[PDB]
Amino acid sequence: SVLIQPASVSGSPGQSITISCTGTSSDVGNYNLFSWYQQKPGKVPKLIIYEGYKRPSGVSDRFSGSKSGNTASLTISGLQAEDEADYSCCLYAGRSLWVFGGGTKVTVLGQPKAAPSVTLFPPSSEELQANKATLVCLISDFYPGAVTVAWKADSSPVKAGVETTTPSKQSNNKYAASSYLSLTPEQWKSHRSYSCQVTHEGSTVEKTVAP
Amino acid sequence: KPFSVPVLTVEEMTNSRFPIPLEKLFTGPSSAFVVQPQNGRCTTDGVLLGTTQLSPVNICTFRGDVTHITGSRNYTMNLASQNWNDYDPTEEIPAPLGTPDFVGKIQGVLTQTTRTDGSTRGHKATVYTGSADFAPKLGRVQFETDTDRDFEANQNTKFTPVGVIQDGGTTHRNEPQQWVLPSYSGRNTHNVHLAPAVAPTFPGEQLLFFRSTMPGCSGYPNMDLDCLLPQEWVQYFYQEAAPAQSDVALLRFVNPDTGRVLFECKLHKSGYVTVAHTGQHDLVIPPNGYFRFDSWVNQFYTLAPM
Amino acid sequence: EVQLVESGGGLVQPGRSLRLSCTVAGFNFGDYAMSWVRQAPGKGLEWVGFIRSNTYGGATGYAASVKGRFTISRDDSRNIAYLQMNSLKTEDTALYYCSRVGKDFGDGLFDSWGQGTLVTVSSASTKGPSVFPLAPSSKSTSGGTAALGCLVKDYFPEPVTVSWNSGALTSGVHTFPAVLQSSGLYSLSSVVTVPSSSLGTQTYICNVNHKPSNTKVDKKVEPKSCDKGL
């Protein structure tokens, strides 16, 4: 069986959201055990609902569950910031087979915009001795996650040679992005000033480096 | 020698009152009727009761030879034992082993084979267990067939059960009555050497029936069939013959994939199961779950609510 | 305390084999059932398989995707749950958790989870990382706090564990996810914000460990100095 979940569900603080978990024609009988697991970025999955509606000890009364044959439902009343995580439903039908759902990303709507903290690092002296040289633009603790990064050598745009990771939701709930620009030593030693430029929601933070 | 129940699931086991596989575990208040089935009655130390035998395919089967009641499509079979030996009506039993312990009309096929040339024949045949002509204890049972000139006397004949019938599509689900014992000796004469009727004695407890659905052949019959023990349990008890250390053995319904025990029940020495619950309820159990013996407990060990 | 520790994963070429072990502590291993569940890169969780308690009849149960290829077993004497992956596919590249089934309050449950283990099914040769120090400067300094880090460049496959001062320095450390370079190699950086007065008075060393390449690098980070003189 395949268990269909929505890709994402959004909601404002205090609202009540609902995640569906839909099965297929694989309806053996009445023993359909639907569990719900919460998973925060960088953390292991945590059982929040079992046996369709029951709750483990320590789980807030904010999470509830319902089971309708092949359609399970996880309701989160009074949405809070710490509820922003991936919720996965797992079905067990009593025939030595567990099936997990696609998971749903619960994101809290609204929240405050955060400014990115940028730090630039020059190539180390050891890296220079091995010729290859890389500039490390580091971005952290901003919100939302979408950030565009540009690189300018001597206040002139630089094309290609740049690779930037995707932003990762931290435990702090503010994304961090990382960008590296790799240059040859002769190319790096030829130009006296380098700069990674970070634009987030119409605001640009500039850092510069000098050999 | 330790007592134990077999490691078999509900879908893997067979009903002990009809050659059909088990389907569910039911529970209900058995107060408005007398639960006294004769088939599937066995004690936890191996003793068979009533008309219970070992072969599950032998249930509701008859063997012997037919004689034609001239003027109708009816036949009278002079019953013999399974081994085709002469049935002994004096044996201290209610009826030949494998006799329908309920009142109703059972449809199946009467088959006959001629001894000499080996020619064979088969015809749809119905038997009324609640009829005045139903006397298996006296070794004579009446069938109603399609034809009236095809069966030969003094030749071996066998009835193979298929399903139950509802007569004229009238009241809907009044027959067969699974908790009404037919008169094994015919009219007037009452039954003899029956198995004792079962009933829960502890408060808040009810019987745990192993329920199957008999096939239907015509009308709107009540196709339910509840047995106190599976036929596999009867076979395992006759094999083990483990001595009972108390009146009640505590059984636990364990899920093998998880080890989590769902419910507990009481398997009495006389051969029936009680669960602490009140009302008509179909048990929602894992298909791969089975019963597990734990220990002999108090004769009135208070169970947990199911 | 119930704890699950998985190990044995790394790099294996497609078609080969690899065995994962899951050690357990804090309960009876022969009492509970254990399930392997994998999570692919950027995808949902996938149940791989499970094994029951030995009392209930051993038995194994796998998913349709890995049936006939992955074999689960266990050793109760050594407290181990084994997952033997045979005839590996590039789709099996995932992080593998081993979890306990539980039997004290539910059925499906999955009450506890391990930390995970990355299995990278790939045919590319392993390459060790190059650790370069990110020295603190006047540009990477605010008010008494200096930012210094380590550049763990050009390695394959994931993961790489970065610790500071043999694990003592934990406050202020930030380890960023690695780039997947166009060359296919990974590269990450881990920075830390220390006091300015601590530079020179305290030694800062980042411990880099890339287990698939059998590489352990202890790189000391110090403020830059020019040998020529400037």
Side-chain angles (χ1 to χ4, degrees), chain A residues 31 37 50 96 126 163 180, chain C residues 52 107 109 181-182 219:
Chain A
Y31 204 51
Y37 305 86
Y50 66 95
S96 309
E126 311 185 23
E163 311 212 344
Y180 310 72
Chain C
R52 303 179 178 173
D107 273 42
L109 275 196
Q181 305 178 88
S182 55
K219 197 72 171 180

Side-chain angles (χ1 to χ4, degrees), chain C residues 20-138 140-200:
Chain C
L20 294 188
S21 316
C22 194
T23 54
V24 289
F27 58 94
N28 263 297
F29 182 75
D31 260 17
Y32 296 78
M34 306 266 286
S35 197
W36 287 97
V37 174
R38 75 183 174 192
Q39 179 164 33
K43 240 57 182 181
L45 299 168
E46 188 188 7
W47 189 72
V48 163
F50 91 114
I51 205 175
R52 303 179 178 173
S53 322
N54 283 325
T55 83
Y56 298 112
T60 54
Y62 327 112
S65 152
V66 306
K67 176 144 43 162
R69 288 168 35 230
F70 292 5
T71 302
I72 193 179
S73 68
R74 54 150 77 186
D75 190 341
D76 313 277
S77 165
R78 328 201 66 79
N79 221 26
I80 313 282
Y82 299 99
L83 165 64
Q84 160 59 241
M85 286 182 256
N86 262 357
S87 174
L88 293 140
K89 260 159 226 198
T90 78
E91 286 103 296
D92 300 316
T93 305
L95 190 93
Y96 283 79
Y97 306 97
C98 120
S99 324
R100 208 187 52 177
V101 155
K103 64 202 220 173
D104 313 308
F105 55 113
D107 273 42
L109 275 196
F110 280 169
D111 79 322
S112 78
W113 288 75
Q115 63 279 92
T117 289
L118 210 64
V119 153
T120 309
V121 163
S122 173
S123 15
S125 306
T126 312
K127 181 179 179 295
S130 300
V131 187
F132 304 106
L134 307 177
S137 73
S138 320
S140 77
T141 298
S142 49
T145 75
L148 60 169
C150 287
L151 176 68
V152 186
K153 190 171 170 88
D154 290 340
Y155 66 91
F156 181 88
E158 288 263 84
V160 162
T161 62
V162 184
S163 65
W164 285 91
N165 290 354
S166 301
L169 180 60
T170 55
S171 186
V173 174
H174 299 295
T175 305
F176 292 79
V179 294
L180 183 57
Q181 305 178 88
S182 55
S183 63
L185 300 174
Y186 289 105
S187 183
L188 66 88
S189 305
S190 181
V191 297
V192 58
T193 51
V194 302
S196 295
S197 56
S198 68
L199 289 171

Side-chain angles (χ1 to χ4, degrees), chain A residues 18-25 28-29 31-35:
Chain A
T18 300
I19 312 166
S20 62
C21 180
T22 280
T24 72
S25 185
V28 182
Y31 204 51
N32 272 356
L33 310 186
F34 287 98
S35 52

Side-chain angles (χ1 to χ4, degrees), chain A residues 54-135:
Chain A
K54 293 187 183 169
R55 283 178 287 155
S57 182
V59 175
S60 170
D61 57 358
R62 258 179 282 136
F63 300 94
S64 34
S66 42
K67 169 258 158 189
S68 159
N70 277 95
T71 316
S73 196
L74 171 70
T75 301
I76 311 175
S77 59
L79 198 64
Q80 302 177 4
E82 58 259 39
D83 296 327
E84 192 165 313
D86 290 305
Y87 295 79
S88 298
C89 64
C90 184
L91 161 72
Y92 165 81
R95 283 164 173 304
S96 309
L97 261 173
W98 272 272
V99 295
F100 274 97
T104 302
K105 184 176 181 178
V106 167
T107 305
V108 176
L109 203 162
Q111 273 186 326
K113 313 169 185 181
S117 307
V118 191
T119 76
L120 260 174
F121 287 92
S124 69
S125 290
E126 311 185 23
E127 211 197 336
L128 292 186
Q129 300 192 6
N131 285 346
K132 34 182 61 173
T134 67
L135 308 180

Side-chain angles (χ1 to χ4, degrees), chain B residues 3 5 233 249-253 263-267 273 291-295 303:
Chain B
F3 175 58
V5 286
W233 283 28
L250 188 50
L251 303 194
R252 260 60 178 274
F253 199 72
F263 72 90
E264 48 178 16
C265 61
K266 294 163 73 168
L267 174 63
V273 188
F291 287 84
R292 177 196 67 194
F293 168 76
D294 276 339
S295 90
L303 287 173

